[PDB]
Coordinates of C-alpha atoms in Angstrom, one line a residue:
Chain A
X1 CA -25.8 38.9 -44.4
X2 CA -27.0 42.3 -43.1
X3 CA -26.1 46.0 -42.7
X4 CA -26.1 47.9 -39.4
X5 CA -29.2 49.9 -40.5
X6 CA -30.7 46.6 -41.6
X7 CA -30.1 44.9 -38.2
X8 CA -31.8 48.0 -36.7
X9 CA -34.9 47.4 -38.7
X10 CA -34.9 43.6 -38.2
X11 CA -34.5 44.0 -34.4
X12 CA -37.2 46.7 -34.6
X13 CA -39.7 44.5 -36.3
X14 CA -39.0 41.6 -34.0
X15 CA -39.3 43.9 -31.0
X16 CA -42.7 45.2 -32.2
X17 CA -44.2 41.7 -32.9
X18 CA -43.6 40.8 -29.3
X19 CA -44.1 44.0 -27.2
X20 CA -46.6 46.2 -29.1
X21 CA -49.6 44.4 -27.7
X22 CA -48.5 45.6 -24.2
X23 CA -48.5 49.3 -25.3
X24 CA -52.1 49.5 -26.7
Chain B
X30 CA -27.4 14.3 -18.2
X31 CA -30.5 16.0 -19.7
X32 CA -29.3 19.4 -18.5
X33 CA -25.8 18.6 -19.8
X34 CA -27.1 17.9 -23.3
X35 CA -29.2 21.1 -23.3
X36 CA -26.2 23.1 -22.1
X37 CA -23.9 21.6 -24.9
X38 CA -26.4 22.2 -27.6
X39 CA -26.7 25.9 -26.6
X40 CA -22.9 26.2 -26.6
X41 CA -22.5 24.5 -30.0
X42 CA -25.3 26.8 -31.3
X43 CA -23.4 29.9 -30.0
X44 CA -20.2 28.5 -31.5
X45 CA -22.0 28.2 -34.9
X46 CA -22.3 24.4 -35.2
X47 CA -26.1 24.0 -35.2
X48 CA -29.1 24.1 -37.5
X49 CA -31.5 25.8 -35.1
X50 CA -31.2 27.6 -31.7
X51 CA -32.4 25.8 -28.6
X52 CA -36.2 25.8 -29.2
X53 CA -38.4 26.8 -26.4
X54 CA -45.9 33.0 -23.4
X55 CA -44.6 35.7 -21.1
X56 CA -43.1 38.8 -22.7
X57 CA -40.8 39.3 -19.7
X58 CA -39.1 36.0 -20.9
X59 CA -36.5 36.0 -23.6
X60 CA -35.8 32.4 -24.4
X61 CA -32.7 31.0 -26.1
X62 CA -34.9 30.4 -29.1
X63 CA -34.6 34.2 -29.7
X64 CA -30.9 33.9 -30.4
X65 CA -30.8 34.4 -34.2
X66 CA -27.4 35.3 -35.5
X67 CA -27.0 38.2 -37.9
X68 CA -23.7 38.9 -39.7
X69 CA -23.0 42.6 -39.4
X70 CA -19.7 44.1 -40.7
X71 CA -18.3 40.6 -40.8
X72 CA -19.1 39.7 -37.2
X73 CA -21.9 37.4 -36.0
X74 CA -24.4 39.0 -33.5
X75 CA -27.2 37.5 -31.6
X76 CA -29.4 39.5 -29.2
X77 CA -32.2 38.5 -27.0
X78 CA -35.5 40.2 -28.0
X79 CA -36.0 42.3 -24.9
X80 CA -38.0 45.3 -23.7
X81 CA -35.1 47.6 -24.4
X82 CA -33.4 46.5 -27.6
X83 CA -29.9 45.0 -27.8
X84 CA -29.1 45.1 -24.1
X85 CA -27.9 41.4 -23.9
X86 CA -26.3 39.4 -26.7
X87 CA -23.5 37.3 -28.0
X88 CA -20.6 38.1 -30.3
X89 CA -19.3 35.1 -32.3
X90 CA -15.8 35.7 -33.6
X91 CA -14.0 33.7 -36.3
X92 CA -10.4 32.5 -35.8
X93 CA -8.1 35.4 -34.9
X94 CA -10.8 37.9 -36.0
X95 CA -10.4 41.4 -34.6
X96 CA -13.0 44.2 -34.2
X97 CA -11.4 47.6 -34.6
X98 CA -11.6 50.0 -31.7
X99 CA -15.0 51.6 -31.0
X100 CA -16.4 53.9 -28.3
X101 CA -18.9 53.2 -25.6
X102 CA -21.5 55.8 -26.8
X103 CA -24.7 55.9 -24.7
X104 CA -24.4 52.8 -22.5
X105 CA -21.7 51.2 -20.4
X106 CA -20.6 47.8 -21.4
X107 CA -19.6 44.5 -19.9
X108 CA -17.9 41.8 -21.9
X109 CA -17.9 38.3 -20.5
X110 CA -16.3 35.4 -22.3
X111 CA -18.8 32.6 -23.2
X112 CA -16.2 30.4 -25.0
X113 CA -12.7 30.7 -26.2
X114 CA -10.0 33.4 -25.6
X115 CA -10.0 37.2 -26.4
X116 CA -7.5 40.0 -26.4
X117 CA -9.0 43.3 -25.3
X118 CA -7.4 46.7 -25.7
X119 CA -9.0 49.5 -23.6
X120 CA -8.3 53.3 -23.9
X121 CA -10.0 55.7 -21.6
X122 CA -11.0 59.2 -22.6
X123 CA -7.5 60.3 -21.6
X124 CA -3.9 59.1 -21.7
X125 CA -2.2 57.6 -24.8
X126 CA -1.2 54.2 -23.3
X127 CA -3.8 51.6 -24.1
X128 CA -4.4 48.8 -21.6
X129 CA -4.2 45.2 -22.9
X130 CA -6.2 42.4 -21.3
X131 CA -6.4 38.6 -22.0
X132 CA -9.8 37.0 -21.2
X133 CA -10.5 33.3 -21.2
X134 CA -13.8 31.6 -20.6
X135 CA -15.7 33.1 -17.7
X136 CA -13.5 36.2 -17.5
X137 CA -15.3 39.6 -17.6
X138 CA -14.1 43.2 -18.3
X139 CA -16.0 46.3 -17.5
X140 CA -16.0 49.1 -20.1
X141 CA -17.1 52.4 -18.8
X142 CA -18.8 55.4 -20.4
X143 CA -16.9 56.8 -23.4
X144 CA -14.0 54.3 -23.2
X145 CA -12.7 53.1 -26.5
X146 CA -12.2 49.3 -26.8
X147 CA -11.1 46.7 -29.4
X148 CA -11.6 43.0 -29.3
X149 CA -9.6 40.2 -31.1
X150 CA -10.1 36.5 -31.0
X151 CA -6.9 35.1 -29.6
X152 CA -7.0 31.6 -31.0
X153 CA -7.6 29.6 -34.2
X154 CA -11.1 28.6 -33.2
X155 CA -14.5 30.3 -33.0
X156 CA -14.7 32.4 -29.8
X157 CA -17.9 33.7 -28.3
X158 CA -18.4 36.8 -26.2
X159 CA -21.4 37.9 -24.2
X160 CA -22.1 41.7 -24.2
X161 CA -24.0 43.2 -21.4
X162 CA -25.1 46.8 -21.8
Chain C
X29 CA -10.0 20.5 -27.1
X30 CA -8.2 22.8 -24.7
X31 CA -10.9 25.5 -24.8
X32 CA -13.9 23.1 -24.7
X33 CA -12.1 21.3 -21.9
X34 CA -11.5 24.6 -20.1
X35 CA -15.2 25.7 -20.4
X36 CA -16.4 22.4 -19.0
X37 CA -14.3 22.9 -15.8
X38 CA -15.9 26.3 -15.2
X39 CA -19.4 24.8 -15.4
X40 CA -18.4 22.1 -13.0
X41 CA -17.0 24.7 -10.6
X42 CA -20.2 26.8 -10.8
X43 CA -22.3 23.6 -10.4
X44 CA -20.5 22.7 -7.2
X45 CA -18.9 19.7 -8.9
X46 CA -15.3 20.0 -7.7
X47 CA -10.3 46.2 -15.0
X48 CA -10.4 42.5 -15.6
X49 CA -12.4 40.3 -13.1
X50 CA -11.4 36.8 -13.9
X51 CA -13.3 33.6 -13.0
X52 CA -10.6 32.4 -10.5
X53 CA -11.6 35.5 -8.4
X54 CA -15.1 34.2 -8.0
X55 CA -15.5 33.2 -4.4
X56 CA -18.9 31.9 -3.5
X57 CA -20.8 32.9 -0.4
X58 CA -23.9 31.3 1.1
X59 CA -26.7 33.6 2.2
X60 CA -29.9 32.0 3.5
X61 CA -28.8 28.6 2.2
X62 CA -28.1 29.8 -1.4
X63 CA -24.6 30.1 -2.9
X64 CA -23.7 33.4 -4.5
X65 CA -20.6 34.4 -6.4
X66 CA -20.2 38.0 -7.7
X67 CA -17.7 39.6 -10.1
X68 CA -15.8 42.6 -8.8
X69 CA -17.5 45.6 -10.6
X70 CA -17.5 49.3 -9.9
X71 CA -21.0 49.0 -8.6
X72 CA -21.1 46.1 -6.2
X73 CA -23.1 42.9 -6.9
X74 CA -24.1 44.0 -10.4
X75 CA -23.1 40.7 -12.1
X76 CA -23.0 37.3 -10.4
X77 CA -24.1 33.7 -10.1
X78 CA -26.7 32.0 -7.9
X79 CA -26.1 28.3 -7.3
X80 CA -29.2 26.4 -6.2
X81 CA -29.4 23.0 -4.6
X82 CA -32.0 20.4 -5.9
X83 CA -35.5 22.0 -5.8
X84 CA -34.1 24.8 -3.6
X85 CA -36.2 27.9 -3.3
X86 CA -35.3 31.6 -3.0
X87 CA -37.6 33.8 -0.9
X88 CA -39.7 36.3 -2.7
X89 CA -37.9 39.6 -3.1
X90 CA -38.5 43.0 -4.8
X91 CA -36.4 44.7 -7.4
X92 CA -36.4 47.9 -5.4
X93 CA -33.6 50.3 -6.4
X94 CA -32.7 48.1 -9.4
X95 CA -34.0 46.3 -12.6
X96 CA -32.9 42.7 -13.0
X97 CA -32.2 40.1 -15.5
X98 CA -32.0 36.4 -14.7
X99 CA -30.2 34.1 -17.2
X100 CA -29.9 30.4 -16.6
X101 CA -26.3 29.2 -16.7
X102 CA -27.2 25.6 -16.0
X103 CA -30.4 23.6 -15.2
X104 CA -34.0 24.7 -15.0
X105 CA -35.7 27.3 -12.8
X106 CA -39.2 28.3 -11.8
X107 CA -39.6 32.0 -11.5
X108 CA -42.7 33.7 -10.1
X109 CA -43.3 37.5 -10.7
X110 CA -45.8 39.9 -9.3
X111 CA -46.1 43.1 -11.4
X112 CA -47.0 46.6 -10.3
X113 CA -50.7 46.6 -9.5
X114 CA -51.3 43.0 -10.6
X115 CA -53.1 40.5 -8.4
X116 CA -52.2 37.4 -10.4
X117 CA -48.7 35.9 -10.3
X118 CA -47.0 35.0 -13.5
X119 CA -45.2 31.7 -13.7
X120 CA -42.3 31.1 -16.1
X121 CA -40.1 28.0 -16.7
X122 CA -36.5 28.9 -17.8
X123 CA -34.0 26.4 -19.2
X124 CA -30.3 26.9 -20.0
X125 CA -29.8 30.1 -22.0
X126 CA -33.3 31.4 -21.2
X127 CA -33.6 34.8 -19.6
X128 CA -36.3 36.8 -17.8
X129 CA -36.4 40.6 -17.2
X130 CA -37.7 41.7 -13.9
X131 CA -38.7 45.4 -13.9
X132 CA -38.4 47.9 -11.1
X133 CA -41.0 47.3 -8.4
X134 CA -41.7 43.7 -9.5
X135 CA -41.7 41.1 -6.7
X136 CA -40.2 37.8 -7.8
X137 CA -39.3 34.4 -6.4
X138 CA -37.0 31.7 -7.8
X139 CA -37.2 27.9 -7.3
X140 CA -34.9 25.3 -8.8
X141 CA -37.3 23.3 -10.9
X142 CA -35.3 20.0 -11.1
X143 CA -33.5 17.4 -8.9
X144 CA -30.0 18.7 -9.9
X145 CA -28.0 21.7 -9.0
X146 CA -29.0 24.6 -11.2
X147 CA -27.1 27.9 -11.7
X148 CA -28.4 31.2 -12.9
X149 CA -26.6 34.4 -13.7
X150 CA -28.1 37.6 -12.2
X151 CA -27.5 40.7 -14.4
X152 CA -28.1 44.2 -13.0
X153 CA -28.5 47.0 -15.4
Chain D
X29 CA -47.8 70.1 -56.6
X30 CA -44.8 68.4 -54.9
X31 CA -46.1 69.1 -51.4
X32 CA -49.7 68.2 -52.3
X33 CA -48.4 64.9 -53.9
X34 CA -46.4 64.0 -50.9
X35 CA -49.3 64.6 -48.5
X36 CA -51.6 62.5 -50.7
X37 CA -49.4 59.5 -50.9
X38 CA -48.8 59.6 -47.1
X39 CA -52.6 59.5 -46.6
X40 CA -53.0 56.6 -49.0
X41 CA -50.2 54.7 -47.3
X42 CA -51.7 55.2 -43.9
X43 CA -55.1 54.0 -45.4
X44 CA -53.3 50.8 -46.7
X45 CA -53.3 51.9 -50.3
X46 CA -50.2 52.1 -52.5
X47 CA -47.8 49.5 -51.1
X48 CA -45.1 52.2 -51.1
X49 CA -44.1 54.3 -48.0
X50 CA -43.1 58.0 -48.2
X51 CA -39.4 58.0 -49.1
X52 CA -31.7 60.4 -34.0
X53 CA -34.6 62.3 -32.5
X54 CA -36.2 62.3 -35.9
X55 CA -38.7 59.5 -36.8
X56 CA -39.6 60.0 -40.5
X57 CA -42.8 58.7 -42.2
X58 CA -41.1 56.2 -44.5
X59 CA -40.0 54.4 -41.3
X60 CA -43.7 53.8 -40.3
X61 CA -44.3 50.0 -40.3
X62 CA -47.9 48.8 -39.6
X63 CA -48.2 45.8 -37.2
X64 CA -51.4 43.9 -36.8
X65 CA -52.2 43.5 -33.1
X66 CA -55.4 41.9 -31.9
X67 CA -56.7 42.3 -35.5
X68 CA -56.1 46.1 -35.7
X69 CA -53.3 47.8 -37.6
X70 CA -50.9 49.9 -35.5
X71 CA -47.9 52.0 -36.6
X72 CA -45.9 53.9 -34.1
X73 CA -43.1 56.5 -34.4
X74 CA -39.8 55.7 -32.8
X75 CA -39.7 57.8 -29.6
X76 CA -37.6 57.7 -26.5
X77 CA -40.7 56.5 -24.6
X78 CA -42.0 53.7 -26.8
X79 CA -45.3 53.8 -28.6
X80 CA -46.2 57.3 -27.4
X81 CA -47.3 58.5 -30.9
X82 CA -48.8 56.3 -33.6
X83 CA -51.6 55.6 -36.0
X84 CA -54.5 53.2 -35.7
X85 CA -55.9 51.9 -39.0
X86 CA -59.4 50.5 -38.8
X87 CA -61.1 48.2 -41.3
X88 CA -64.7 48.9 -42.4
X89 CA -67.0 49.1 -39.3
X90 CA -64.3 47.5 -37.2
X91 CA -64.7 48.2 -33.5
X92 CA -62.3 47.8 -30.6
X93 CA -64.3 47.2 -27.5
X94 CA -63.7 49.3 -24.4
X95 CA -60.3 49.5 -22.7
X96 CA -59.1 51.7 -19.9
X97 CA -56.4 54.4 -20.0
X98 CA -54.4 52.6 -17.4
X99 CA -50.9 54.2 -17.0
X100 CA -51.1 57.0 -19.7
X101 CA -53.7 59.6 -20.7
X102 CA -54.3 59.7 -24.4
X103 CA -55.7 61.9 -27.1
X104 CA -57.4 60.5 -30.2
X105 CA -57.3 62.7 -33.3
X106 CA -58.9 61.5 -36.6
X107 CA -56.4 61.4 -39.4
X108 CA -58.9 60.1 -42.0
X109 CA -62.5 58.8 -42.0
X110 CA -65.2 58.7 -39.4
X111 CA -65.2 57.2 -35.8
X112 CA -67.7 56.6 -33.0
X113 CA -66.1 56.8 -29.6
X114 CA -67.8 55.8 -26.3
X115 CA -66.4 57.1 -23.1
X116 CA -66.9 55.8 -19.5
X117 CA -65.8 57.7 -16.4
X118 CA -64.5 56.1 -13.2
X119 CA -67.7 55.6 -11.3
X120 CA -70.2 56.6 -14.0
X121 CA -72.5 54.0 -15.4
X122 CA -73.9 56.0 -18.4
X123 CA -71.5 56.2 -21.4
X124 CA -71.3 59.3 -23.5
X125 CA -71.3 59.0 -27.3
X126 CA -69.1 61.0 -29.6
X127 CA -68.8 61.2 -33.4
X128 CA -65.4 62.3 -34.7
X129 CA -64.6 63.3 -38.3
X130 CA -61.2 64.1 -39.9
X131 CA -59.4 66.6 -37.7
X132 CA -61.7 66.1 -34.7
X133 CA -60.0 65.3 -31.3
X134 CA -61.1 63.6 -28.1
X135 CA -59.1 63.7 -24.8
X136 CA -59.3 60.5 -22.7
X137 CA -58.2 61.0 -19.1
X138 CA -56.4 58.3 -17.1
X139 CA -58.7 55.7 -15.8
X140 CA -61.5 56.5 -18.3
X141 CA -62.8 53.5 -20.3
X142 CA -63.2 54.1 -24.0
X143 CA -64.2 52.3 -27.1
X144 CA -63.6 53.1 -30.8
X145 CA -65.6 51.9 -33.8
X146 CA -65.0 52.8 -37.5
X147 CA -68.2 54.5 -38.5
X148 CA -68.0 53.9 -42.3
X149 CA -67.5 51.1 -44.9
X150 CA -64.0 52.4 -45.6
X151 CA -60.7 52.3 -43.8
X152 CA -60.5 55.1 -41.2
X153 CA -57.3 56.2 -39.5
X154 CA -56.8 57.5 -36.0
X155 CA -53.8 59.2 -34.4
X156 CA -53.2 58.2 -30.8
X157 CA -51.2 60.7 -28.7
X158 CA -50.3 59.5 -25.2
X159 CA -48.8 61.7 -22.5
Chain E
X25 CA -64.5 59.8 -52.0
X26 CA -66.6 62.0 -49.8
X27 CA -64.2 61.3 -47.0
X28 CA -61.2 62.2 -49.2
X29 CA -62.6 65.6 -50.1
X30 CA -63.4 66.2 -46.4
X31 CA -59.8 65.7 -45.4
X32 CA -58.6 67.9 -48.3
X33 CA -60.9 70.7 -47.1
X34 CA -59.3 70.4 -43.6
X35 CA -55.8 70.6 -45.1
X36 CA -56.5 73.7 -47.3
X37 CA -58.1 75.3 -44.2
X38 CA -54.9 74.6 -42.3
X39 CA -52.7 75.8 -45.2
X40 CA -54.5 79.2 -45.2
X41 CA -56.1 78.5 -48.6
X42 CA -64.7 66.6 -28.0
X43 CA -62.6 69.4 -29.7
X44 CA -63.7 69.5 -33.3
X45 CA -61.7 71.1 -36.1
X46 CA -64.4 73.8 -36.3
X47 CA -63.4 74.9 -32.7
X48 CA -59.8 75.6 -34.0
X49 CA -59.3 79.4 -34.0
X50 CA -56.0 80.6 -35.5
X51 CA -54.3 83.5 -33.6
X52 CA -51.1 85.2 -34.8
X53 CA -48.3 85.6 -32.3
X54 CA -44.9 87.1 -33.3
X55 CA -45.9 86.8 -37.0
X56 CA -46.8 83.1 -36.8
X57 CA -50.3 81.6 -36.9
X58 CA -51.3 79.3 -34.1
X59 CA -54.4 77.1 -33.6
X60 CA -54.8 74.9 -30.6
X61 CA -57.3 72.3 -29.5
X62 CA -59.2 72.8 -26.3
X63 CA -57.5 70.4 -23.8
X64 CA -57.5 70.1 -20.0
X65 CA -53.9 71.4 -19.9
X66 CA -53.9 74.5 -22.2
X67 CA -52.2 74.5 -25.6
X68 CA -50.8 71.1 -25.5
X69 CA -52.0 70.0 -29.0
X70 CA -52.0 72.5 -31.8
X71 CA -50.9 73.6 -35.2
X72 CA -48.2 76.1 -36.3
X73 CA -48.8 77.7 -39.7
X74 CA -45.7 79.1 -41.4
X75 CA -45.5 81.5 -44.3
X76 CA -43.0 80.8 -47.1
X77 CA -39.5 80.4 -45.6
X78 CA -40.9 81.9 -42.3
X79 CA -38.6 81.7 -39.3
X80 CA -39.4 80.8 -35.7
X81 CA -37.0 82.2 -33.1
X82 CA -35.0 79.8 -31.0
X83 CA -36.8 78.7 -27.8
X84 CA -36.1 76.2 -25.0
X85 CA -38.3 73.3 -23.9
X86 CA -38.3 74.6 -20.3
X87 CA -41.0 72.8 -18.3
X88 CA -42.0 70.5 -21.1
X89 CA -40.7 67.9 -23.6
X90 CA -41.9 68.5 -27.2
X91 CA -42.9 66.6 -30.3
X92 CA -43.0 68.2 -33.8
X93 CA -45.0 66.5 -36.6
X94 CA -45.2 68.0 -40.1
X95 CA -48.8 68.3 -41.3
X96 CA -47.9 69.9 -44.6
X97 CA -44.7 71.1 -46.4
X98 CA -41.1 70.9 -45.3
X99 CA -39.3 72.3 -42.3
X100 CA -35.7 73.0 -41.1
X101 CA -35.3 72.2 -37.4
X102 CA -32.2 73.1 -35.4
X103 CA -31.7 71.6 -32.0
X104 CA -29.1 72.4 -29.3
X105 CA -29.0 69.8 -26.5
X106 CA -27.9 70.8 -23.0
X107 CA -24.2 70.6 -22.6
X108 CA -23.7 70.1 -26.4
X109 CA -21.8 72.7 -28.4
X110 CA -22.8 71.8 -31.9
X111 CA -26.2 72.4 -33.4
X112 CA -28.0 69.5 -35.0
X113 CA -29.9 70.1 -38.2
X114 CA -32.8 68.1 -39.5
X115 CA -35.2 68.5 -42.4
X116 CA -38.8 67.2 -41.9
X117 CA -41.3 66.4 -44.6
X118 CA -45.0 65.6 -44.3
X119 CA -45.5 62.9 -41.6
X120 CA -42.0 63.2 -40.3
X121 CA -41.6 63.8 -36.5
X122 CA -38.8 65.0 -34.2
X123 CA -38.8 64.8 -30.4
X124 CA -37.5 67.8 -28.4
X125 CA -36.4 66.8 -24.9
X126 CA -36.7 69.1 -21.9
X127 CA -34.1 71.8 -21.8
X128 CA -32.9 71.5 -25.4
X129 CA -33.0 74.7 -27.5
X130 CA -34.7 74.4 -30.9
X131 CA -35.5 76.6 -33.8
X132 CA -37.9 76.0 -36.8
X133 CA -37.9 77.4 -40.3
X134 CA -40.2 76.7 -43.2
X135 CA -37.8 75.2 -45.8
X136 CA -39.8 75.8 -49.0
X137 CA -41.6 78.6 -50.9
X138 CA -45.1 77.4 -49.9
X139 CA -47.1 77.6 -46.7
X140 CA -46.1 74.7 -44.4
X141 CA -48.0 73.5 -41.4
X142 CA -46.6 71.7 -38.3
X143 CA -48.4 69.9 -35.5
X144 CA -46.9 70.6 -32.0
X145 CA -47.5 67.9 -29.4
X146 CA -46.6 68.4 -25.8
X147 CA -46.9 65.1 -23.9

């Protein structure tokens, strides 16, 4: 259902939606 | 009884018989609700959404499925069996003879820097592995 | 049945209910009233289990030389964290499968939140 | 023409126009995804230390009220538009007012409290450089 | 539109065609044009202006890590990490960034037949 580059982006988006507010 | 039912519904979810992960504030906290399974290169992967990415997750293997040898690149690895049975082959940066290990539930193997390893589901059922980087 | 029935007996063992480091080599020792079982790793005490009695509490401690992850193997836990510089304690409730990351310098305490034995896996990075 | 066209479509993308992005240690511009956090759009490059270099996209006259440079000193450089920045020192009570146009830069030391407001009725874009 | 043309007049200035852009003086060192903002620590944020296919000699990030962001054009960057034997090659277009860790040796070349401008960020 996904490629390895695709998992990297999906994990990257999910990481940002949770942790970006603590780096601003 | 309540904790037993929650424990079984997590296991069944990890084993792939579930419609939704165990549903759950604090960013330090990665709840079981963050275990979404993605199929990559034919293997199911679920990682907790954590501060450093992909440091703790689960590998769901289909019956007798094997993952070809790979190398521990930038981080050391620990493989702990969540459910089922696995055959692990380990090859260090030297020597030609590979080490063969059988891991059942609860067993753990440490994979050091640079070591090449392969994983095979040893049985005709779904087997689940926890990967700790 | 054999594998499901084998996994259940490991949980019961961890719950107190009756380079490969296997589960049979997990001997539990009690320190300050809490049961600990650690896997044999190159670095000592990097991966183990903490078994808590009903509503048992673990004294506040600091992740000094090491970052920590707490993953609930069974039951429910109350974890309190004190971050670097922060005056307010953060409280989290963790059920089975839930995990918390405790950074370097953070002071943390753990209490079993329920009236049953609860087991957490401590993962050192 | 090619270089001027690539530069123009990067700017429009950062401004929120276009819908199309500019197609290991390299973090390229087409990998810049904007996330809305507390109502302001942020896009950061993938760096070893997370969120050390990024862009802040402001809506017309949108302001972010004062926050403190807690653990990292920062530099604000205007990528596009106009900004009003207010700075407050450690023990100082009087805030200093700055107007920054494209290319202008302000250095915010650790502990300084600062605020940013988009000065115009258009999207303005800021580059945040933390050390 | 007034804001678009103001940004274009900054770019053309950089292409050779509070620290404000007007306080940016370009000084040539070893054949390369440098303009730095006035910061507390000197020369930590600036621009490198390259002539067509101009080359920058290999240097080492000694006491600092480095970040390279392309303001205009295209660049060829070669990096040699410490201990590593093989050079890594990357091409950067406008908006692309590469991080240069402490101790790694790096070289930069303008990859095209136009003036290219790079922003150098020491953090």
